[PDB]
Design a binder for this molecule. Structure first.
Ligand SMILES: *[C@@H]1O[C@H](CO)[C@@H](O[C@@H]2O[C@H](CO)[C@@H](O[C@@H]3O[C@H](CO)[C@@H](O)[C@H](O)[C@@H]3O)[C@H](O)[C@H]2NC(C)=O)[C@H](O)[C@H]1NC(C)=O
Ligand SMILES: [Zn+2]
Length: 299
């Protein structure tokens, strides 16, 4: 009973899918667009803006964009992506379609498609809220290192992590669900963390339900019942370091086009996107609808 809204999805994606390197004018437009879109979908919207030095360009202005429904709730489901496009010396026009225009558009579209719930019955409660986090400056400028990467997430985590024996705001996040590298044909998602295996399993079972009911395109399994054997550093790392459980929805293998100019709209696979959206919007709905007591995946 949650239907597609591909018109909204396409429109949202078209607005995000422009070059948007930190420090650029195009980046500022996308930031403003994210704030406007969140306000328009019923979120209380805040920006975490700060200056920091990066290789080559020196001091730039970063801005994490955060939307919350039920800001007073005791606990939160946090869904996230990065909205910056990577700086490339040879490719100022990189649009990062899978990385992560599509992920950010998926967050907004999930809000839209579940809007009849989120903007009404979901407001009448204090146990759980919903956060959509658009991290800035995930991408390195020179080489990915512990200094040069995840600028925005590092900052937001430190902020949420900053009376003495009370819970820090970050401890109110039951799970950070981070989407990255989505939009290529036939993505495969494996479970990176034992403590969120239960949530990964729920995506597996929701996919099986939707498939069985004839609601998915094609016969490819997207959510696998397997543990990961790789390592993927990403915006979740600063949350993991503060003991926040993580579900890391990054396709492995990476899209063929990763970090090349061909990570563009022409190389997206719309059936895969639509299938991911179907599973994901139901996962989010079920998590929130079934939430009664504080969810404990830390201890
Ligand atoms: C949202 O955006 C996507 C991407 O532009 C739209 O997907 C496109 O949808 C059209 C119409 O269904 C597809 O046209 C088809 O072309 C194939 C041959 O390539 C042909 O077999 C069909 O008869 C039809 O003409 C098109 O392939 C498809 N493009 C991609 C890249 O998937 C989609 O319709 C948009 N949805 C909206 C605006 O609701
Ligand atoms: Zn990237």
């Amino acid at each position: 009973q949650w239907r597609d809204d591909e018109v909204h999805f396409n429109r949202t994606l078209d607005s995000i899918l422009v070059p948007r390197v930190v420090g650029s004018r195009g980046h500022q437009q996308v930031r403003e667009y994210l704030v406007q879109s969140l306000n328009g979908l019923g979120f209380q919207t805040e920006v975490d803006e700060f200056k920091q030095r990066v290789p080559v360009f020196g001091e730039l202005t970063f801005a994490n964009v955060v939307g919350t429904i039920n800001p007073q709730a005791q606990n939160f489901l946090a869904l996230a992506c990065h909205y910056d496009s990577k700086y490339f010396p040879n490719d100022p026009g990189f649009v990062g379609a899978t990385d992560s225009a599509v992920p950010c558009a998926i967050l907004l579209n999930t809000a839209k498609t579940l809007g009849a719930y989120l903007q009404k019955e979901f407001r009448n409660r204090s146990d759980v809220g919903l956060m959509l986090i658009f991290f800035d400056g995930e991408e390195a400028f020179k080489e990915w290192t512990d200094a040069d990467s995840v600028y925005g997430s590092k900052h937001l985590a430190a902020k949420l992590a900053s009376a003495q024996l009370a819970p820090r705001n970050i401890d109110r996040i039951e799970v950070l669900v981070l989407l990255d590298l989505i939009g290529a044909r036939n993505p495969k998602f494996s479970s990176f963390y034992e403590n969120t295996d239960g949530l990964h399993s729920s995506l597996v079972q929701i996919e099986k339900s939707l498939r069985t009911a004839g609601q998915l395109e094609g016969n490819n399994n997207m959510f696998l019942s397997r543990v990961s054997g790789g390592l993927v550093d990403d915006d979740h790392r600063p949350f993991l370091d503060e003991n926040v459980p993580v579900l890391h929805l990054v396709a492995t293998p990476f899209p063929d086009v990763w970090h090349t100019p061909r990570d563009n709209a022409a190389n997206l696979h719309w059936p895969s996107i639509r299938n991911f959206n179907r599973v994901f919007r139901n996962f989010v709905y079920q998590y929130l609808k079934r939430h009664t007591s504080p969810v404990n995946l830390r201890f």
